[PDB]
């Protein structure tokens, strides 16, 4: 899997839009581990368990972990916005609702390989985008 530069652009705007990256191009140092752990959880336990774990808002974590799931949703929406007409016949090009829970969206849409592939690519893009900035 090769990460495109447009995916990294989407990741940068999504990390700024949620609030991972501050106005001085800095981020809390724990989001690096958050994204790495999300990738590991997706590869090991599965898409749904990892999404449920990192989507939870009533955490004991130092920072807001659910913002990485928000960044995921924004990156996936940006990726789907550029889907071609012939892609929309095979792939689902509908936009994920902003207030919708990502885990329940995945569950209602099944467990299709499209969603898992998009999540993995977006997680790698998030990791690469964080690698471009300073850890506080």
């Amino acid at each position: 899997m090769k990460i495109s530069k447009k995916q990294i652009e989407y990741a940068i705007e999504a990390l700024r839009a949620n609030n991972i990256i501050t106005n001085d191009n800095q981020y809390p140092k724990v989001f690096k581990g958050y994204i790495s752990s999300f990738g590991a959880a997706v590869i090991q336990s599965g898409l749904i368990p990892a999404i449920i774990f990192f989507e939870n808002e009533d955490n004991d974590a130092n920072a807001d972990r659910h913002k990485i799931i928000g960044v995921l949703k924004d990156i996936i929406n940006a990726m789907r916005q550029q889907y071609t007409v012939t892609d929309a016949t095979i792939l689902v090009s509908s936009q994920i609702p902003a207030n919708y829970s990502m885990a329940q969206y995945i569950i209602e849409h099944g467990n299709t390989d499209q969603l898992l592939k998009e999540i993995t690519e977006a997680a790698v893009a998030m990791k690469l985008a964080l690698r471009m900035y300073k850890s506080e």
């Binding site: 899997m1 990460i3 990738g39 997706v42 590869i43 090991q44 592939k117 993995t120 997680a123 990791k127």
Partner: protein, 279 residues
């Protein structure tokens, strides 16, 4: 006589590294076929491992494999080693611990390879495999399928809730094909097998480096699951008969175990090489 098909049965989790950089979860990926994107062994790696096994017999290695690197006399090797392609992969289930999974495209590729290379005992295998593939295509009628040939494995979950096994009573499985492909065989569609063999579904092993009991490094390694079957073609390039006989005898001896791939010291790539049994 010239061309023989050998089956590789792995006894541990095998890793033949592709050596490429992956910036995702898995730092070390395995070799994949350039065309079919299925796990494979490069013929160079196979030849190197087998040459390492036979290194003691200097005359046999010199005649069969060729001259050692940077020897004064560079003589070519006579036996030609072809790359090993994935035949069967174990898949986790709920009715049995694991099942032998092969796709229709893998079967078609095997049939085409036997047709092109003209293996020793290829005629009966091609006939029966073509009959099985035709029956499978007739039963499937263009849809996704997961066909088991044991009635007790009906409704088994093949590693994914979507993939469920159905037993077509009409399609027979010959005992020699069962021996070649493996017990508890399931025939999967290309989509199902590709999903079950992609980078998000292949087994990964987590490793860390400890300094005074404290973790320094951490990475994930992709592995080919234990008891996986791969087939490769051996061509007898006018090599001497007695050395060839010794080579095939040692290679096919049940006591012989060969290490292929990386992480030899931690017991990764240990395999058994079998010849294509007559039908």
């Amino acid at each position: 006589m010239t061309t023989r098909m050998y089956v590789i049965n792995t006894l541990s989790n095998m890793h033949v590294g592709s050596g490429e950089v992956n910036y995702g979860v898995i730092a070390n990926l395995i070799q994949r076929d350039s065309v079919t994107n299925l796990p494979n062994i490069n013929s160079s790696g196979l030849k190197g491992a087998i040459r390492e096994y036979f290194k003691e017999n200097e005359d046999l290695v010199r005649e069969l494999f060729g001259s050692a690197p940077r020897d004064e006399k560079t003589l070519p090797g006579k036996v030609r080693f072809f790359e090993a392609n994935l035949l069967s992969m174990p898949v986790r289930s709920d009715k049995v611990p694991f099942l032998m999974a092969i796709s229709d495209e893998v079967l078609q590729e095997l049939i085409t390879k036997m047709k092109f290379f003209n293996c020793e005992e290829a005629t009966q295998y091609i006939s029966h495999l073509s009959t099985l593939l035709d029956n499978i295509k007739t039963q499937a009628q263009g849809t996704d399928f997961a066909y088991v040939f044991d009635p007790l494995l009906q409704g088994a979950i093949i590693e994914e809730v979507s993939i469920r096994a159905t037993c077509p009573s009409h399609i027979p499985l010959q005992p020699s094909l069962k021996k070649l492909l493996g017990d508890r065989l399931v025939i999967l569609s290309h989509k199902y097998f590709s999903i079950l063999s992609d980078d998000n579904h292949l087994p990964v092993l987590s490793r860390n480096n400890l300094e005074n009991g404290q973790s320094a490094n951490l990475w994930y390694e992709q592995v080919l699951p234990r008891y996986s079957r791969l087939y490769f073609m051996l061509m007898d390039g006018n090599a001497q008969s007695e050395y060839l006989k010794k080579f095939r005898d040692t290679l096919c001896t049940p006591s012989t175990i060969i290490q292929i791939g990386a992480n030899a010291s931690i017991g990764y790539g240990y395999c058994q090489i079998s010849e294509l049994s007559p039908f």
